[PDB]
Amino acid sequence: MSYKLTYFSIRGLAEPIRLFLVDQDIKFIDDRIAKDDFSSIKSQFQFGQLPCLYDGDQQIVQSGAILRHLARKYNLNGENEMETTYIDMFCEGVRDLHVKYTRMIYMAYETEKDPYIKSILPGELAKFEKLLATRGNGRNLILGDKISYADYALFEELDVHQILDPHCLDKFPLLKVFHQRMKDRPKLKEYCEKRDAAKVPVNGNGKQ
Amino acid sequence: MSYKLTYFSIRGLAEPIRLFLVDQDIKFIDDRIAKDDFSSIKSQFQFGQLPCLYDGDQQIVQSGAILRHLARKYNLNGENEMETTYIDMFCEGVRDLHVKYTRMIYMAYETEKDPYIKSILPGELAKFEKLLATRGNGRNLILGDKISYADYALFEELDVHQILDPHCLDKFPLLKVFHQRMKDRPKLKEYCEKRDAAKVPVNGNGKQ
Ligand SMILES: CCCCCCSC[C@H](NC(=O)CC[C@H]([NH3+])C(=O)O)C(=O)NCC(=O)O
Ligand SMILES: CCCCCCSC[C@H](NC(=O)CC[C@H]([NH3+])C(=O)O)C(=O)NCC(=O)O
C-alpha cells in the first residue's frame, strides 16, 4: 500500500492520524514497531522520532504536519481561511492538554494523577466545552456539519481522559455528546471495539 | 492598527511572529503586557493564554496557528503541497527543540544547563543541519531561494541557543550561515539590534 504510518504499538501521538485514516476509509499500513527495534532504525527519521507517514515516495514526520497534510489532501482543512485557522487553533489547544496529560503519565503518575483529575483537568475541559459551542451550537462537529482533522484529535483526547477519569465529562454535555457521536461513526465504532478487545495501551509505560 | 499582538514583555513564543511581521513590513501594535496584569484579562482568551493575534475582528490564539495563518495570508506558506508540508514539519521540529529549551530554562536551569549544552543540544542541532541540506543544499533558506514562515522560527531558535551557548553553531556550517544570513536582512537587523540594546529578556524568569 501507498500510505504507511510508522509508530510504536500504543495509541500515543499517532492515534488521531489512525482515526483520520480509518474514518475516511483511507487504506494504510499500520506499521507498529517494538520499542527495542527503534534504535536500529531511528536515524532514518528526520528528528529521530515517530510517528512517520510515508505517502508514496514522501516521508513525513511530526504528527501535526502529518495531520495537516492529510487534511489538505482529503479536504478536511476547512472551507475558507477562517475555518482553517479555527480548526488549527482548536487542534493546538488539544495538543496542549495532551502535553499536560503525558507529563503526568510519564513523570509523576503515582502522585499527580489525583490532583490532575481534580484540579487541572476540569478547567482545561471547560475551555473546549465553550469553544466547541461556537459552530453549530457544538451539537455536531467542530465546524458544524462537516468533519475536519481537529475532530479526530479532540475525540482521542476525550477518550483517553475518560479512561483516566470515567466521570470527567459529566459537567460538559457538549463534549460528552461529541465524544459519543464520534465513537458512533460506523468505521470508528468498529475500530474502537477492536482496539478495546486488544486493550491497546494508551501510553508507552502501561499507565492510563 | 489592523494587527495587535498581545504577549508578555519577553521574546518567548511570540518572537517568531514579531520577526515575521517586522521583516514583511506588516505594521502591528506590539502589545507587551506586565505579568501582574494578565490575571485580570485571562478569561478573554480561548485557552486562557498568550500570545494572541487580533487580525481585524478575528481573535487568534496559539502561536503555531497564528504563524500558519500569517503565512497563508502573505504567501510565505510554500508554493506547493510538498513545500507546505516540509516547512510545517521543519517548524514543528523547531518547536520540539524549544520545548526542551524552555523545560531546562524554567524547571532546572542551574542543574541541567550544562548537560543540555553538552549532551542534548548538539544532537538536536545535527538533525537540523542534515535536514536543512535537503533543499538548496541548505545554503540559502529552508525552501532554497524563497523565504517562508519556518525561517523566522529557526532563526529565533538558533539565536536564543547562541545566547545560551555562544559556540553551539561552530561545527554546524549550514545553521551558522543561515543565522548569519537571516541576521543580515535589513529589517531584522534593525529590529533585533534595538531589541538587544533594550535588553529584552528571552524568557519570563530572567534566565537565558
Ligand atoms: C516509549 C514510547 C512512547 C513514547 C511516547 C512519546 S511519542 C514517541 C516519541 N516521538 C515524539 O515525541 C514526537 C513528537 C513530535 N512533536 C510529534 O508530534 O510527532 C519518540 O519517537 N520517542 C522515541 C525516541 O525518541 O527514542
Ligand atoms: C510568564 C512569562 C513566561 C511565559 C512563557 C510561556 S508562554 C506564556 C503562556 N502561554 C502558553 O504556554 C501558550 C502555549 C500555546 N501552545 C501556544 O503555542 O501559544 C501563558 O499565557 N502563560 C500564562 C498563564 O497560563 O497564566
Residue with CA at minimum distance from ligand 2 atom 21: B49
Q: Among the atoms of ligand 2, which is closest to the Cα of residue B64?
A: 18
Torsion of CA A32, B65, A93, B202, to 10 degrees: 100
- Cell (9 digits) for B20: 515575521
Measure in Å the smallest separation between the Cα of A59 and chain B Cα atoms: 10
Grid coordinates given for A149: 482533522
Q: How far is CA A194 from CA A11, A80, A151, A199, B134, in A?
A: 13, 36, 20, 8, 40
- Contact partners, residue A105, CB within 8 Å, separation at least 6: A203, A205, A207, A208
Q: Do strands B3-8 and B29-33 pair parallel, antiparallel, or not at all (unpaired)?
A: parallel
Given an 8 Å threshold on Cβ–Cβ distance, is B68 in contact with A61?
no
Cell numbers at residue B107, please?
A: 524547571
Distance between start and end Cα atoms, chain B = 32
Amino acid at B66: I
Peptide bond into A51 cis (omega under 30): yes
DSSP secondary-structure letter at A34? P
Q: What stretches of chain A show up as alpha helix (H) in DSSP?
A: 15-24, 38-41, 63-73, 81-107, 109-115, 121-132, 149-164, 173-184, 186-197
Amino acid at B103: R
Cα B26 to Cα A56, A63, A89, A141: the distances in Å are 38, 31, 22, 35
3-class DSSP string for chain B: CCEEEEEECCCCCCHHHHHHHHHCCCCCEEEEECHHHHHHHHHHCCCCCCCEEEECCEEEECHHHHHHHHHHHCCCCCCCHHHHHHHHHHHHHHHHHHHHHHHHHHHCHHHHHHHHHHHHHHHHHHHHHHHHCCCHHHCCECCECCCCHHHHHHHHHHHHHHHHCCCCCCCCHHHHHHHHHHHCCHHHHHHHHHHHHCCCCCCCCCCC
Cβ neighbours for A183, distance < 8 A, ≥ 6 positions apart: A155, A159, A189, A192
Q: Around Cβ A54, how many Cβ atoms within 10 Å?
A: 17
Residue A15, Cβ density class (10 Å: 0-12 exposed, 13-18 middle, ≥19 buried): buried
Pairing of the two strands B29-33 and A29-33: unpaired
Tell me, what amino acid is at B14? A
User: Closest by alpha carbon to A2, among A19, A20, A21?
Assistant: A21
**Cα–Cα distance measured from residue B98 to residue B87, given in angstroms and rounded to the nearest whole number:** 16
Crossing angle between the packed helical segments B81-107 and B63-73, to the nearest 10 degrees = 150
Residues 6+ apart with CB under 8 A from A122: A168, A171
**Substitution site in A10, A50, A70, A105 for ligand 1 pocket (most atoms within 8 Å of beta carbon):** A50
**Are the CB atoms for A132 and A175 separated by under 8 Å?**
yes
For residue A127, the chain B residues in CB contact (below 8 A) are 46-48
| Per-residue H/E/C for B167-194 | CCCCCCHHHHHHHHHHHCCHHHHHHHHH
In three-state secondary structure terms, A55 is strand
Q: Which residues line ligand 1 (CB under 6 A)?
A: A 8, 10, 12-13, 35, 38, 48-51, 62-64, 204; B 92, 96
Closest CA to B24 of B147, B145, B139: B147
Q: Which residues contact B101 (CB under 8 A, 6 or more apart)?
A: B116, B157, B160, B161, B164
Amino acid at B81: E
Count CB neighbours of B33 within 10 A. Answer: 14
Closest residue by Cα to residue A155 from A183, A135, A174:
A183
DSSP class of residue A116 equals I
From chain B, pick out residues whose CB is under 8 angstroms from the CB of A65: 85, 88-89, 92
Nearest residue to A203 via CA among A168, A164, A176: A164
Residue A18 is placed in which grid cell?
A: 489512525
Angle between the A149-164 and A63-73 helix axes, to the nearest 10 degrees?
140
Which residues in chain A have their CB less than 8 angstroms from residue B78's CB? none
Distance CA B53, CA B28 (A): 10
Closest C-alpha among B36, B68, B37, B38 to residue B50: B38
DSSP assignment letter at A58: E
Mutate to test the interface with A, among B67, B70, B85 (most CBs of A within 10 A): B85
Cell of A165: 477519569
The β-bridge relationship of strands A52-55 and A29-33 is: unpaired
CA distance to A19, A49, A60, B94, per residue, from A70 (Å): 12, 19, 11, 21
Other CB atoms closer than 10 Å to residue B20's CB: what's the count? 23
Determined by X-ray
Q: Are A129 and A62 in contact (CB under 8 A)?
A: no
Q: Are A179 and A169 in contact (CB under 8 A)?
A: yes
CB–CB of B135/B143 below 8 Å? yes
SS3 A118: helix
Strands A58-61 and B3-8: unpaired
Instruction: Judge whether B162 is annotated as a binding position.
Output: no
Alpha carbons A72 and B62: distance in angstroms, whole number: 20
In contact, A20 and A7? CB cutoff 8 Å? no
Q: Are B12 and B203 in contact (CB under 8 A)?
A: yes
Q: Give the three-state DSSP class for A86.
A: helix
Helix (H, G, I), strand (E, B) or coil at A54: strand
Domains and CATH numbers, chain B: 1-76+186-208 (3.40.30.10), 77-185 (1.20.1050.10)
Alpha-carbon span A81 to B90, nearest angstrom: 22
Using CA atoms, how far apart are residues B171 and B193, in angstroms rounded to an integer? 25
Spacing of C-alpha A107 from chain mean position: 21
CA angle A73, A78, A83 (to 5 degrees): 150
- Spatial neighbors of A17 by CB under 8 A, at least 6 apart, are A5, A51, A53, A63, A66, A67, A70, A152
Q: Other C-beta atoms within 10 Å of B114: how many?
A: 10
